[PDB]
Amino acid sequence: DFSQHPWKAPGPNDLRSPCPGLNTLANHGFLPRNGRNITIPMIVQAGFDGYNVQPDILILAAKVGLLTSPEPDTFTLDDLKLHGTIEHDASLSREDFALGDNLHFNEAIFNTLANSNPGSDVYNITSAGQVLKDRLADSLARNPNVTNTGKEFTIRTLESAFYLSVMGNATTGEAPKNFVQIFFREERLPIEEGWKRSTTPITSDTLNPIAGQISEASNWKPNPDQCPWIVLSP
Amino acid sequence: VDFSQHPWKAPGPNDLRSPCPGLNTLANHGFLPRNGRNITIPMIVQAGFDGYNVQPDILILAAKVGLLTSPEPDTFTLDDLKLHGTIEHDASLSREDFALGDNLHFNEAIFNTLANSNPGSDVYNITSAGQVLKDRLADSLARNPNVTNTGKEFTIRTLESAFYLSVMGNATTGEAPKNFVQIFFREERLPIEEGWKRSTTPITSDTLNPIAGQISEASNWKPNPDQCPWIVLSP
Ligand code: HEM
Ligand code: HEM
Ligand SMILES: [Mg+2]
Ligand SMILES: [Mg+2]
């Protein structure tokens, strides 16, 4: 029932993340609107309620997210900005940590995703891959501190599988462009615009094939002498 | 803390245990569930404080990484913690390498090195701890073609050695009566009847790290050249 879950703009003391997925859930009150005191069970519930995303992938992501917080079993959405845990260079809608603000939505960065799949009414696996190339190529040219290993790349293919899957079709990875634009720009569920919570459950068995196809369409190579790492503590 | 309400009891076949004498001992006295199940990060902080006077910072971090070994949302079992390459590492003090046998259970043959350390002394110390780290790594290098030896394992090994010296011994000097350390590993018991008292000084990152750092210097250690440190993220 989305009627109990109206969108509201985050106010002054309301903490947000670099993740449109969680920010959208907070802005609809599926997570605390203040973005504080989030447990792994609250993530599993908000993800299932909002998007029909199943626990498997949410538990893993939330456990890694926890490492960004000094708290025993909670994090704030602001904690999740910690560079090198999940937050990575070559984001779709955020600047690289080394160049500026790795937290907030940035229209200038988002422009690439916005303008992708020209002449189509959807983003798809092909356009998602092209955006991954363009964003990485940007960070490699302007960021001498770029981190581009297997870890960041896997997360990038998964995050791109996420926007295609939760705003669009979880099997084909096609998503109406206006749904994806609203998701990123307003961190809002485009309910009035016709968006429905996925009827098909979003699992690692649906996300992985989509992430894999985005990967193939990205024509990716790692930086040669970089070791994959999860920063373990703030 | 009242240890009278926390009696040692031999773990049964019902009861899940880890490769960690620290947690296993806490479970054996009922500071953690004796069945070794349904352990939250808050239960770890409390059991660590109650049993050993260990402060939350280092326990929170260790427990959050331990969680990665579990498919459950916010709990692990002690048996989950055996997952090779999360925390569990080659060149353990009392367990065999995953590649060569059992990386879970106490092994007397492996423990022999630590047991015979600091010969002609009644205590184990930073010097003997360092020598045991060299000897155990050298053993794994000789016998384990698949040995993983990077900054991550080494840091964890210096910390785990700082832990046995600190919780069974003196948290400032890193000296520990040998029979305390030997019961801790062999029986996963607080040696209360044998005179062990919970540390009066709080065991923190600021007490552990200096000890781990000195153990490191006494270990004369080098990483394997072409290995990347990594935390295995899921079973
Ligand atoms: C619930 C479904 C989820 C969806 C649909 C989702 C979606 C996304 C998307 C599309 C991005 C890419 C943003 C960009 O590159 O500009 C992203 C980034 C991120 N997400 Fe999620 N997410 C979800 C769950 C989670 C969870 C559970 C966590 C952590 C607990 C998380 C943490 C992050 C972080 C830290 C980033 C920053 C990565 C970066 O761009 O550098 N997300 N998410
Ligand atoms: C609370 C005080 C703690 C103490 C005194 C302690 C002590 C130790 C010691 C001495 C070892 C080395 C055993 C050996 O090499 O044979 C060890 C190993 C281990 N501990 Fe802990 N520990 C503590 C807390 C924790 C916590 C909170 C976790 C995870 C939640 C944990 C997980 C492990 C694991 C997985 C190993 C296996 C490492 C290996 O030898 O391969 N311990 N612990
Ligand atoms: Mg980023
Ligand atoms: Mg081991």
Residue numbers in the entry:
A (entry chain A): 6 to 239
B (entry chain C): 5 to 239
Direct quotes from the study:
Unspecific peroxygenases (UPOs) are a class of heme‐thiolate oxygenases from fungi that have similar catalytic scope to P450s, but are dependent only upon hydrogen peroxide (H2O2) as the external oxidant. A recent survey by Faiza and co‐workers explored the diversity of UPOs within sequence databases and was able to identify two major groups of enzymes: ‘long’ UPOs (Group I), typified by AaeUPO, of approximately 45 kDa molecular weight, and ‘short’ UPOs (Group II), typified by the enzyme from Marasmius rotula (MroUPO), which are of approximately 29 kDa. In this study, we have cloned the gene encoding an ‘artificial’ short UPO (artUPO) close in sequence to MroUPO, and expressed it in both Pichia pastoris and E. coli. In addition to their overall similarities in fold, artUPO, MroUPO and HspUPO feature both a glutamic acid and histidine residue (E164 and H93 in artUPO) that forms the catalytic acid‐base pair, in common with CPO and in contrast to the Glu‐Arg dyad found in AaeUPO.
The structure of the artUPO expressed in E. coli was also determined to see if there were any significant differences that may result from a lack of in vivo glycosylation. artUPObact crystals were obtained in the P212121 space group and again featured two molecules in the asymmetric unit, forming a dimer that was again connected by a disulfide bridge between residues C232. The monomers superimposed with an rmsd of 0.26 A over 232 C alpha atoms, reflective of their very high structural similarity. Few obvious differences could be discerned between the structures of artUPOyeast and artUPObact, except that the N‐terminal residues D6, F7 and S8 could be modelled in the latter, but not the former, and there was of course no glycosylation on asparagine sites N42, N129, N150 and N174 in the bacterially expressed enzyme. We studied both the melting temperatures (T m) and onset of aggregation temperatures of artUPOyeast and artUPObact using nano differential scanning fluorimetry (nano‐DSF). artUPObact gave a simple profile with a calculated T m of 47.8 °C, but artUPOyeast gave a more complex two‐phase profile from which the first T m was determined to be 45.5 °C, but the second value could not be determined. The results clearly show that the onset of aggregation for artUPObact of approximately 59 °C is significantly lower than that for artUPOyeast. This lower stability may be a direct consequence of the lack of glycosylation and was indeed manifested in visible precipitation of artUPObact in biotransformation reactions (vide infra). Despite this difference in peroxidase activity, the catalytic efficiency of peroxygenase activity toward NBD of artUPOyeast and artUPObact was more or less equivalent. The enzyme was challenged with para‐methylthioanisole 23 under similar reaction conditions to those used for artUPOyeast, giving a 65 % conversion to sulfoxide after 2 h.
